[PDB]
Amino acid sequence: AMSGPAAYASYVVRGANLVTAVSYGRAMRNFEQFMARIVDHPNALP
């Protein structure tokens, strides 16, 4: 026995709303969580 998907894999459009109000405080909070992943999980990266 084995398992798979029910139907063919459909595409999703990403990049419509770019939201351009990106702040400095949220970018540093995203950068600290991103650099911690290289030490934590090098293969699983968001």
């Binding site: 139907a7 063919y8 894999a9």
Partner: protein, 49 residues
Amino acid sequence: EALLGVYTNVVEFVKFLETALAAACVNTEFKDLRRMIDGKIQFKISMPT
């Protein structure tokens, strides 16, 4: 009046996704292949050392 017996064949129907050949493929539901640039889907390879 007397009866009549009808026997029909029963054929197993093939779906491509259910057969185990589709582990050798990624199957993509797509709409529009006419919009592609010819002979070019580039992909960049970075090999670490």
